[PDB]
Amino acid sequence: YSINNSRQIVDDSGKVVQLKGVNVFGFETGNHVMHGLWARNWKDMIVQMQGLGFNAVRLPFCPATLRSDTMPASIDYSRNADLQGLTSLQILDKVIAEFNARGMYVLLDHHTPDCAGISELWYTGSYTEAQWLADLRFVANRYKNVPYVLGLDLKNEPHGAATWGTGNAATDWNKAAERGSAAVLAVAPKWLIAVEGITDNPVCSTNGGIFWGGNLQPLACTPLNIPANRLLLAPHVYGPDVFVQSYFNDSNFPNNMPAIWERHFGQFAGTHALLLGEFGGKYGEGDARDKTWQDALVKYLRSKGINQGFYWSWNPNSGDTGGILRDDWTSVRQDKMTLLRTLWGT
Ligand SMILES: O=P([O-])(O)O
Ligand SMILES: O=P([O-])(O)O
Ligand SMILES: O=P([O-])(O)O
Ligand SMILES: O=P([O-])(O)O
Ligand SMILES: O=P([O-])(O)O
Ligand SMILES: O=P([O-])(O)O
Ligand SMILES: O=P([O-])(O)O
Secondary structure (H helix, E strand, O other): OEEOOOOOEEOOOOOEEOOEEEEOOOOOOOOOOOOOOOOOOHHHHHHHHHHOOOOEEEEEEOHHHHOOOOOOOOOOOOOOHHHOOOOHHHHHHHHHHHHHHHOOEEEEEEOOOOOOOOOOOOOEOOEOHHHHHHHHHHHHHHHOOOOOEEEEEOOOOOOOOOEOOOOOOOOEHHHHHHHHHHHHHHHOOOOEEEEOOEOOOOOOOOOOOOOOOOEOHHHHOOOOOOOOOOEEEOOEEEOOOOOOOHHHHOOOOOOOHHHHHHHHOHHHOOOOOEOEEEEEOOOOOOOHHHHHHHHHHHHHHHHOOOOOEEEOOOOOOOOOOOOOEOOOOOOEOHHHHHHHHHHHOO
16 A cells, blocks of 8 residues: 555555545453454454445554463354454454455554553553564564555554654654654555654644644654655544533634644645544534534545544444444444545545
8 A cells, every 4th residue: 555646545556545444442452352242243243334334444452462372351152153262363363354355444553552541652661662663563564465454553642741853762752653664664565654643742733632642733843754655644533522622612613623623633634644543422422512523523524635534433332432333232323324424425
């Protein structure tokens, strides 16, 4: 895959790819397997999400999942007989192979260093940058021949102490992304590299009201040393039911939002390939405003020439947004799907 001069994703053939995507969680958690396999058959659940119109999937994972003898949990083996005995690595192998056989694009995502919380930086007190890079190379090495695997989202949701272009090696996400980029492309040179934003930054940023991995402002001062034809920018953005930012409370709302989205990520759409790695919310099951907010975001995305991204999420059991499926793991939120098809232009 690559990025052409029109900021479009093209495949090996040279045809434009459109990512009608959604996030599928589980592999980055204590269970070390995609969620819902207590309620559903994994193959049938994939079949369903393609049928709704999705052709792309973002797969969070964690280091533990990639280890040889890590066992999965919460799997109902009555509904999932062909996973019995398999290690979580072998289940990941089998899931990526299934997406591939169905012709569904897969963006792998290094979500958490410890199968729990999301780290501020690319390293912790028990997970070094060396381990981080090695794990990226491991994944790239393993799946580099799986045609429909798109590439790698280097690290999920940088925030807190993370900075960009300050000259401080311990916190500069931009430089860490360059090193992650180099590692992945050395092994899988046809993979795309997805890079997320940070939050508040001491330089080249108007701060405040920023979501994790949501600020790309410092890119204007400090370009990424990542090949133009591989770099995919993938910030996150959420609405009122994730956090009540002050601007949500504004009387102007939601007319005030486009300037804020423009500032945080939007202004880069015209010169960089860009999509949202995560966006979503309860869509009226949670608030009056989240309906309005999601509608406005789609309207703004369409206007910036953006008709792709990865909705958050497939799974219901995401605190604070819900998903495409309801809590019965079978019923589909039709209004959420109508919103996405609007975004996709379908
Ligand atoms: O596929 P390339 O020509 O962008 O490297
Ligand atoms: O198999 P890994 O997680 O040690 O790279
Ligand atoms: O049912 P399969 O995927 O194990 O052949
Ligand atoms: O992963 P945490 O829960 O220790 O932050
Ligand atoms: O298992 P790792 O994270 O040390 O590669
Ligand atoms: O000092 P650095 O962050 O530019 O390496
Ligand atoms: O770095 P930009 O300003 O050319 O997008």
